[PDB]
Design an enzyme around this catalytic site. Structure first.
Site, mmCIF file in Angstrom:
data_model
loop_
_atom_site.group_PDB
_atom_site.id
_atom_site.type_symbol
_atom_site.label_atom_id
_atom_site.label_comp_id
_atom_site.label_asym_id
_atom_site.label_seq_id
_atom_site.Cartn_x
_atom_site.Cartn_y
_atom_site.Cartn_z
ATOM 1 N N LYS A 275 66.339 98.523 39.006
ATOM 2 C CA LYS A 275 67.002 99.231 41.094
ATOM 3 C C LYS A 275 66.629 97.162 41.173
ATOM 4 O O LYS A 275 67.338 96.549 42.547
ATOM 5 C CB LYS A 275 66.734 100.017 41.922
ATOM 6 C CG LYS A 275 67.561 101.360 41.050
ATOM 7 C CD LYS A 275 66.735 102.449 41.211
ATOM 8 C CE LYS A 275 67.094 103.567 40.421
ATOM 9 N NZ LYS A 275 66.824 105.298 40.960
ATOM 10 N N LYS B 140 58.025 97.905 42.482
ATOM 11 C CA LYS B 140 58.866 98.908 42.411
ATOM 12 C C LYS B 140 58.662 99.689 41.099
ATOM 13 O O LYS B 140 58.249 98.906 39.868
ATOM 14 C CB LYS B 140 60.365 97.854 42.193
ATOM 15 C CG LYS B 140 61.196 99.452 41.547
ATOM 16 C CD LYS B 140 61.812 99.744 43.039
ATOM 17 C CE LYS B 140 62.589 101.387 42.894
ATOM 18 N NZ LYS B 140 61.804 102.464 42.237
ATOM 19 N N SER B 141 58.517 101.252 41.557
ATOM 20 C CA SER B 141 57.954 101.105 39.987
ATOM 21 C C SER B 141 59.139 102.259 38.975
ATOM 22 O O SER B 141 60.337 102.384 40.135
ATOM 23 C CB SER B 141 57.158 102.613 40.582
ATOM 24 O OG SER B 141 58.021 103.750 41.672
ATOM 25 N N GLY B 142 58.678 103.213 38.468
ATOM 26 C CA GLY B 142 60.050 103.735 37.303
ATOM 27 C C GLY B 142 59.299 104.976 36.820
ATOM 28 O O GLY B 142 58.282 104.989 36.531
ATOM 29 N N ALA B 143 60.398 106.319 36.487
ATOM 30 C CA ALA B 143 60.054 107.094 35.955
ATOM 31 C C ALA B 143 60.774 107.281 34.443
ATOM 32 O O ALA B 143 62.041 107.050 35.030
ATOM 33 C CB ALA B 143 58.998 108.150 36.184
ATOM 34 N N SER C 279 64.360 104.505 45.572
ATOM 35 C CA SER C 279 64.339 105.583 44.244
ATOM 36 C C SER C 279 65.946 106.012 44.050
ATOM 37 O O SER C 279 65.653 107.009 43.476
ATOM 38 C CB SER C 279 63.399 105.824 43.714
ATOM 39 O OG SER C 279 63.251 105.522 42.002
ATOM 40 N N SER D 192 63.785 102.821 36.519
ATOM 41 C CA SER D 192 63.902 102.975 38.435
ATOM 42 C C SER D 192 63.331 101.265 38.773
ATOM 43 O O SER D 192 64.026 100.724 39.689
ATOM 44 C CB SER D 192 63.933 103.857 39.238
ATOM 45 O OG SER D 192 64.670 104.471 39.008
ATOM 46 N N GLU E 230 73.203 105.572 36.104
ATOM 47 C CA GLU E 230 71.582 106.974 36.340
ATOM 48 C C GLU E 230 72.287 108.196 36.134
ATOM 49 O O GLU E 230 73.831 107.966 36.770
ATOM 50 C CB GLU E 230 71.075 106.977 37.873
ATOM 51 C CG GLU E 230 69.901 105.477 38.343
ATOM 52 C CD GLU E 230 69.243 105.816 37.287
ATOM 53 O OE1 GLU E 230 68.812 106.689 37.184
ATOM 54 O OE2 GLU E 230 67.853 105.054 37.564
#
Length: 263
Positions: free
Chosen positions: A48, A209-212, A105, A45, A141
């Protein structure tokens, strides 16, 4: 700082997985720390942010309007859509979709936004024409989170992503207003709590901004700094681990503590 680099190395051993890392002075563009800077990782993510930079560039050029409203169907909803699933009836503005995409997210938000610009291939073209010939987006996504080992799809490198974020936030690409909005969305991040944020002292700025993704992939991009103004960009990824989300969060947060401690 070496200690930070040690934490990153230690993170890599403990998770049993590749960790990429870059510190970058926001003003001068100087790399302050590095680890596997030219290796590829799944963006998850963190794409984004790039996506909404592309949207904002269309806004600047008059191909988009932030208040333009987009309606969608229940079919359009993909896994994890906390905001978009609430507005099937009224729809959402482009600005609202970017807020949903970046602060929460929201995946359907990201897909609707991808549709506005022409899809993954066009996001890549955007990145290409801003001098990032490394970072590529290939799928939507949720399938962009697959993180197949050595798959090049939907990846970036720490140094390409650090570079591209610094150009988006502080470069000539976007108007002052659109770069303020993009960092405003990132400052309002609600799902990156246990990561870099956990390490910040009171009164520090952070936009992130994080992501997994699948197969242990985790990541965060961030422009943070002391006394309420950012001064550095940090990019941090990892993929391959079998570790729980909780341990991946704690590793990132531990790396965050060294960066702060040795600022």
């Amino acid at each position: 700082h070496p200690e930070t680099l040690v934490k990153v190395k230690d993170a890599e051993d403990q998770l049993g997985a590749r960790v990429g890392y870059i510190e970058l002075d926001l003003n001068s563009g100087k790399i302050l720390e590095s680890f596997r800077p030219e290796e590829r990782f799944p963006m998850m993510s963190t794409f984004k942010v790039l996506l909404c930079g592309a949207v904002l560039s269309r806004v600047d050029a008059g191909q988009e309007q932030l208040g333009r409203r987009i309606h969608y169907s229940q079919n359009d909803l993909v896994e994890y859509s906390p905001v978009t699933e609430k507005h099937l009836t009224d729809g959402m503005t482009v600005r609202e979709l970017c807020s949903a995409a970046i602060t929460m997210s929201d995946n359907t938000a990201a897909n609707l936004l991808l549709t506005t610009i022409g899809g993954p291939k066009e996001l890549t073209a955007f990145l290409h024409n801003m001098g990032d010939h490394v970072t590529r987006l290939d799928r939507w996504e949720p399938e962009l989170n697959e993180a197949i080992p050595n798959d090049e799809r939907d990846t970036t490198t720490p140094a390409a992503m650090a570079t591209t974020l610094r150009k988006l936030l502080t470069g000539e690409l976007l108007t002052l207003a659109s770069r303020q909005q993009l960092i405003d969305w990132m400052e309002a991040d609600k799902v990156a709590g246990p990561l870099l944020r956990s390490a910040l002292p009171a009164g520090w700025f952070i936009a992130d901004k994080s992501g997994a993704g699948e197969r242990g992939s985790r990541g965060i991009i961030a422009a943070l700094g002391p006394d309420g103004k950012p001064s550095r960009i940090v990019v941090l990824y990892t993929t391959g681990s079998q570790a729980t989300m909780d341990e991946r969060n704690r590793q990132i947060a531990e790396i965050g503590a060294s960066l702060i401690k040795h600022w």
